[PDB]
Design brief:
nucleotide binding, binds flavin mononucleotide, TIM Barrel, 14 helices, alpha/beta, globular, NAD, nucleotide-binding, nitronate monooxygenase activity
Length: about 325
């Protein structure tokens, strides 16, 4: 339906991407998005070891014959993280595209390029995207203030950040954060982007391998139900509002709050159970404010189909109509 710099550069049918999703980005999710015509990703760090990632990549290929990428998120944890070995695993497996995210991606980006692996780098500010462009990325994913996950500390929504980035970048641009339907796609394209990336919208799909109660919570939540935790630590993260996030905010509000004071609460182990058990209060889990626009649970195939079909109709019906 839509042909853009994104679809041509990455060889996918639709200008829609399913980026990094810790715990969630498993074979089932990626295959579904890949089979749906979009650019999918397996979460590298969701797999406990490089070897596990190799096994997951093979498992995903059993569910889809279409190409898919891998997300390599650069966690700030000072704990043993064999990124190099993970990269090696991703490369050896023949992955053609990788989505990097986090701080100082230089080292990894360069390596992937040396082996013919295209790199999409997700960043939260124009200055970061430029630095990445100078590093040689194939595309930049501009993540706005609306996004689930880490939006950085500038607090600039996509409506402004996107055109500000388009004003300076040359490589393809992927709008990320706050998108869920065709209206968002057109808006993103009009603002200078060539595709949209979504996370929360994919949680609310049939194939997303998470407990049904989590999918139900996204559907019930309005746009005002997310919290920004760890702002006082300059490690801001937008997560689903729950007893846990509210607690960490109370701790930060008290003053003199260190990571060790909340570590147990923001535990990834504790957060991974939300998805497997369905206990939305067990721990911290990522969700964007765009949840307020979501209230259904389609199969990925129809979702992507409907988004581009909705977008096309907005152009030829609504927009062209106003010009007629
Ligand atoms: C459950 C969940 C887990 C996520 N995990 C990661 C991750 O590990 N690394 C990363 O770079 N982004 C991660 N993200 C962010 C998404 O890739 C994307 O940038 C963001 O969801 C866009 O905002 P949206 O939720 O409004 O679509 C996650 C998002 C969700 C909803």
């Amino acid at each position: 339906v839509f042909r853009t710099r994104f679809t041509e550069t990455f060889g996918v049918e639709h200008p829609i991407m399913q980026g990094g999703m810790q715990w969630v980005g498993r074979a089932e999710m990626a295959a579904a998005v890949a089979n749906a015509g979009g650019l999918a990703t397996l979460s590298a760090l969701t797999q406990p070891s490089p070897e596990a990632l190799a096994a997951e990549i093979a498992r995903c290929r059993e569910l889809t014959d279409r190409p898919f990428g891998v997300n390599l998120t650069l966690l700030p944890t000072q704990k043993p993280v064999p990124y190099a070995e993970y990269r090696a695993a991703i490369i050896e497996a023949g992955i053609r595209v990788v989505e990097t995210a986090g701080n100082d991606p230089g080292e990894h980006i360069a390596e992937f390029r040396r082996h013919g692996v295209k790199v999409i780098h997700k960043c939260t500010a124009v200055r970061h995207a430029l630095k990445a462009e100078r590093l040689g990325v194939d595309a930049v994913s501009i993540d706005g203030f609306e996004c689930a996950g880490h939006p950085g500390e500038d607090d600039i929504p996509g409506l402004v950040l996107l055109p500000a980035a388009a004003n300076r970048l040359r490589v393809p641009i992927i709008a990320s954060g706050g998108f869920a339907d065709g209206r968002g796609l057109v808006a993103a394209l009009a603002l200078g982007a060539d595709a949209i990336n979504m996370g929360t919208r994919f949680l609310a799909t049939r194939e997303c391998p998470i407990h049904p109660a989590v999918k139900a919570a996204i559907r019930a939540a309005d746009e005002r139900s997310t919290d920004l935790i760890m702002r006082s630590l300059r490690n801001t993260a937008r997560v689903a509002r729950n007893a846990i996030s509210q607690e960490v905010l109370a701790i930060e509000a008290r003053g003199g709050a260190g990571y060790a004071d909340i570590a147990a609460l923001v535990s990834g182990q504790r957060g991974r159970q939300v998805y497997q058990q369905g206990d939305t209060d067990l721990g911290i889990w990522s969700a964007g404010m765009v949840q307020g626009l979501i209230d259904d649970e389609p199969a990925c195939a129809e979702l992507l189909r409907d988004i581009v079909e909705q977008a096309r109709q907005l152009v030829r019906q609504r927009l062209e109509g106003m010009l007629a």
